[PDB]
Design a protein around this ligand. Structure first.
Ligand code: CL
Ligand code: CL
Length: 158
C-alpha cells in the first residue's frame, strides 16, 4: 500500500462532475472545486473542453497532481515539515491524506496532535485527533486515518 491507494479508497472515483454533500463540485479522485466555474477549473486542469466528463487516465493524472500539491504544501509549511520528516512512511501517508482532504492550514492547526506525532506518542496523538470537528464531520475516514497514525500500519485499509 501507498498514499495513492490509500486516498483512492478514501476519495473514491467519479468520472463525471458531481456535487457533494457540502455543495462543492467534485470529480475524479477527490478533485474538488457555480458549475460553470467548476468546469472552467476542470478544463484548465485537464487541458481540454471536458464538458464535465473525463477518462480514468485523466482522473489519475489529476489525482497525481493533487497528491503532489499536498506533499509540497507540507514541505513548504514550517509546522508540518518537521513532523513529516520525523515520521515513518506509513504515518507520512496519513499526514498527506489529511492535507489532501482539508488543506495545509487545516492540518497545521492540529498543534497537540502534531507535537505528539513528532514525539512518537501515537496514542496521545490519536486521542487528540479524534477530539476535532474534522473527525466529527467525516468520522469513518478520520477513524481510518487515526488508526494509521496510531499503529503505523495499513490495517485500517485492508
Ligand atoms: Cl490537535
Ligand atoms: Cl477543531
Amino acid at each position: 500500500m501507498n498514499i495513492f491507494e490509500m486516498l483512492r479508497i478514501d476519495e473514491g472515483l467519479r468520472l463525471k462532475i458531481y456535487k457533494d454533500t457540502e455543495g462543492y463540485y467534485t470529480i475524479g479522485i477527490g478533485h474538488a472545486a457555480s458549475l460553470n466555474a467548476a468546469k472552467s477549473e476542470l478544463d484548465k486542469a485537464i487541458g481540454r473542453n471536458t464538458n464535465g466528463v473525463i477518462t480514468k487516465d485523466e482522473a489519475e493524472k489529476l489525482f497525481n497532481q493533487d497528491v503532489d500539491a499536498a506533499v509540497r504544501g507540507i514541505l513548504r509549511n514550517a509546522k508540518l515539515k518537521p513532523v513529516y520528516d520525523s515520521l515513518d512512511a506509513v504515518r507520512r501517508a496519513a499526514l498527506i491524506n489529511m492535507v489532501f482532504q482539508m488543506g495545509v492550514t487545516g492540518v497545521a492547526g492540529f498543534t497537540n496532535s502534531l507535537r505528539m506525532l513528532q514525539q512518537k506518542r501515537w496514542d496521545e496523538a490519536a486521542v487528540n485527533l479524534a477530539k476535532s470537528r474534522w473527525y466529527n464531520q467525516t468520522p469513518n475516514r478520520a477513524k481510518r486515518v487515526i488508526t494509521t497514525f496510531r499503529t503505523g500500519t495499513w490495517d485500517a485499509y485492508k
